[PDB]
Design a protein around this ligand. Structure first.
Ligand SMILES: [Ca+2]
Length: 110
């Protein structure tokens, strides 16, 4: 069901954030990303991480592949269409994911 998709998206984001913490923010105040902005943002991090050696990085790259698909499925669900480098990439990714999570309490704009 859709309830499971929304809950699984939030749970997967928390899982990636925890993985990033293992390699090593005001409530109500956050930037707004659209579904297409969220998708473009994760694709940039995906391109960056895939050309990088590490087993922990490979796993995060697979979680991002699931996350982008969930976003496309959420976009379809509301009748709309979307179509050391490592250290700084993971650190930036974590901040971006915490921003996405904070606005997932509502169905985002397309
Ligand atoms: Ca896919």
């Amino acid at each position: 069901p859709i309830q499971k998709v929304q809950d699984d998206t939030k749970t997967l984001i928390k899982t990636i954030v925890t993985r990033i913490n293992d390699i090593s923010f005001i409530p109500g105040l956050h930037p707004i990303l659209s579904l297409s902005k969220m998708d473009q943002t994760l694709a940039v991090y995906q391109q960056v991480l895939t050309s990088l050696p590490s087993q922990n990085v490979l796993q995060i790259a697979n979680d991002l592949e699931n996350l982008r698909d969930l976003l496309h499925l959420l976009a379809f669900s509301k009748s709309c269409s979307l179509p050391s480098t490592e250290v700084v990439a993971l650190s930036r990714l974590q901040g971006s994911l915490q921003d996405i999570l904070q606005q997932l309490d509502v169905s985002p704009e397309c």
